[PDB]
């Protein structure tokens, strides 16, 4: 009709003939097309959705039903891709599933559907529903999952994640982050697992932390990352603060040696989510008294008008042993150091006696003594299973550790990652052979989809390790490759 009207009409009628043709061929059968909207969208008929959109755009009310159908289809695909997931790889799998849905459907909209703005708005309105979807009578999960995803992507892990790749990962993560209904809850979590990730030196790089903060400084207001930024500007300055403190040591007035490295982490009060100690009054051990009392002077002169509050439940000390043979150094908090102070001069230390040296109430004293006896550096002198006010303790001299700087519960990231990745390969063996019981013959490329579909609610498997693990099934005499067809596989059972 376009060619015919071009051939036999004045140009003023080049748009009324096609308009009146669509009103007698598309707009007159609009219900018949809207009934097929369901089948054309749910089955992802890519060749036909283009014709659907081209026909419906011309007529007046054709588009909104297709917009609603695509929104419903994206909503159901988001729920289907985020219905059931593992409780261990929950953050990364959820974020990557949402990004996969978003990328697939934005490609579909921008290729098949000419990238119409209303279809993109439907995509956004459906992804908003699926991302912060909450079970009834329960709290929404999206903020904590995305905060843990940021934690995992910014932790000093052994995944071989390069700086450029993690920058790309965060820039792609902002796409799902913009769908969070309550980002003030995500910042509550992300500023809390940025306290731990960045007061323990656990951040893999002090530049990716700034990049992630600045990716929320522009995805939200500046006040959003106002406490997130006052932490990052507390640890960058703290490196200068330690140097200034060791130079105040060089004031050259008297001898001001401490015997402790004392690598301080002075932080701002309101910015850090670290609650000031609401209980557990503490007495500084006699070795740290000099460091505390001289850093008080240094922070009195060089920064006048401030009042340090001296958190003690995130401190960390390295204390050697009492000449018990094969000396070790323990990475313990100051809570687990005052109990080792009165423990020095007296081998037999009563619960009452350490109250004059540790001064800490029994609320967390039992907790820290239990944490000590979990690895058993100290033991109950009596036979009492619990800890009472009249208990006694002495050294568990029979205790030994494989490390001089042995860890205490508050290069292991490589070993843990391999063990976690081993369960992925182990499950892949526990996924291939089920097909061998189903059809007994599968092709080389078709087995990838069956394994992935078997692990959709689980980790995303690597294509290389599918081939690598299926070769382990060969020399195990489980399955074998036929010489006639490399794709076809046979097994002994």
């Amino acid at each position: 009709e376009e060619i015919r009207c071009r051939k036999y009409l004045h140009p003023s009628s080049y748009t009324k003939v096609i308009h009146e043709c669509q009103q007698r061929m598309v707009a007159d059968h609009l219900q018949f097309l809207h009934a097929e909207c369901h089948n054309i969208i749910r089955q992802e008929k890519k060749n036909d959705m283009a014709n659907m959109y081209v026909l419906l755009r011309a007529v007046s009310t054709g588009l909104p039903h297709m917009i609603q159908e695509l929104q419903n289809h994206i909503h159901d695909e988001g729920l289907r891709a985020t219905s059931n997931l593992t409780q261990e790889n929950m953050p990364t799998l959820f974020v990557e599933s949402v990004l996969e849905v978003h990328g697939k459907f934005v490609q579909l909209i921008n290729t098949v559907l000419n990238g119409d703005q209303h279809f993109m708005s439907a995509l956004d309105k459906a992804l908003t529903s699926v991302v912060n979807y909450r079970e009834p009578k329960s709290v929404c999960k999206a903020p904590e999952l995305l905060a843990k995803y940021c934690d995992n992507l910014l932790k000093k892990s052994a995944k071989g994640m390069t700086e450029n790749e993690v920058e790309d990962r965060l820039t792609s993560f902002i796409t799902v982050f913009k769908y969070i209904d309550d980002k003030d809850v995500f910042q509550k979590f992300y500023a809390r697992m940025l306290a731990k990730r960045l007061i323990h030196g656990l951040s893999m790089s002090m530049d990716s932390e700034e990049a992630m903060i600045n990716k929320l400084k522009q995805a939200c207001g500046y006040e959003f990352t106002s406490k997130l930024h006052r932490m990052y500007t507390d640890m960058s300055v703290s490196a200068d603060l330690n140097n200034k403190f060791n130079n105040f040591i060089k004031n050259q007035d008297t001898v001001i040696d401490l015997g402790i490295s004392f690598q301080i982490y002075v932080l701002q009060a309101g910015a850090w989510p670290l609650t000031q100690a609401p209980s557990s009054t503490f007495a500084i051990p006699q070795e740290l008294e000099k460091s505390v009392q001289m850093f008080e002077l240094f922070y009195s002169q060089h920064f006048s008008g401030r009042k340090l509050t001296w958190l003690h439940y995130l401190c960390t000390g390295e204390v050697k042993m009492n000449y018990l043979g094969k000396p070790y150094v323990a990475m313990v908090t100051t809570y687990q150091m005052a109990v080792l102070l009165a423990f020095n001069n007296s081998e037999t230390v009563s619960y009452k006696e350490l109250q004059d040296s540790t001064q800490m109430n029994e609320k967390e004293l039992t907790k820290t003594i239990k944490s000590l006896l979990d690895v058993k550096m100290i033991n109950h002198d009596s036979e009492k299973e619990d800890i009472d006010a009249e208990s006694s303790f002495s050294l568990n001299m029979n205790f030994s550790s494989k490390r001089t700087k042995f860890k205490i519960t508050t290069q292991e990231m490589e070993q843990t990652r391999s063990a976690v990745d081993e369960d992925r390969k182990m499950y892949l063996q526990a996924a291939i052979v089920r097909i061998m019981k189903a059809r007994k013959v599968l092709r080389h490329n078709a087995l990838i989809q069956e394994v992935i579909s078997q692990s959709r609610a689980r980790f995303n498997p690597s294509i290389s390790m599918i081939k690598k693990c299926i070769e382990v099934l060969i020399d195990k005499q489980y399955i074998e490759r036929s010489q006639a067809s490399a794709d076809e596989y046979s097994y002994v059972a």
Partner: protein
């Protein structure tokens, strides 16, 4: 002889002449409540824990309990009160 080697101590700094207070009692937030400084100081005491909510405001537990007697909203921004940090 137990000897320490390094101490990775942490410390929050606050302005000395800017004092944070529980907005209801108008006493020091780490200090005792106004009811804990007049009535239950001798009797029980040692129970004026700093209440925290989604409002992210610091209140004495006794003060916020007396505030929640007849009205629900937080007395600094009129937001809903959840007392869940």
């Amino acid at each position: 002889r137990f000897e320490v080697k390094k101490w990775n101590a942490v410390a929050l700094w606050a302005w000395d002449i800017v004092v944070d207070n529980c907005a209801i009692c108008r006493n020091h937030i780490m200090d005792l409540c106004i009811e804990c400084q007049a009535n239950q100081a001798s009797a029980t005491s040692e129970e004026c824990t700093v209440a925290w909510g989604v409002c992210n405001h610091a209140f004495h537990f006794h003060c916020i309990s007396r505030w929640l007697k007849t009205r629900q909203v937080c007395p600094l921004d009129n937001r809903e009160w959840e007392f869940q940090k």
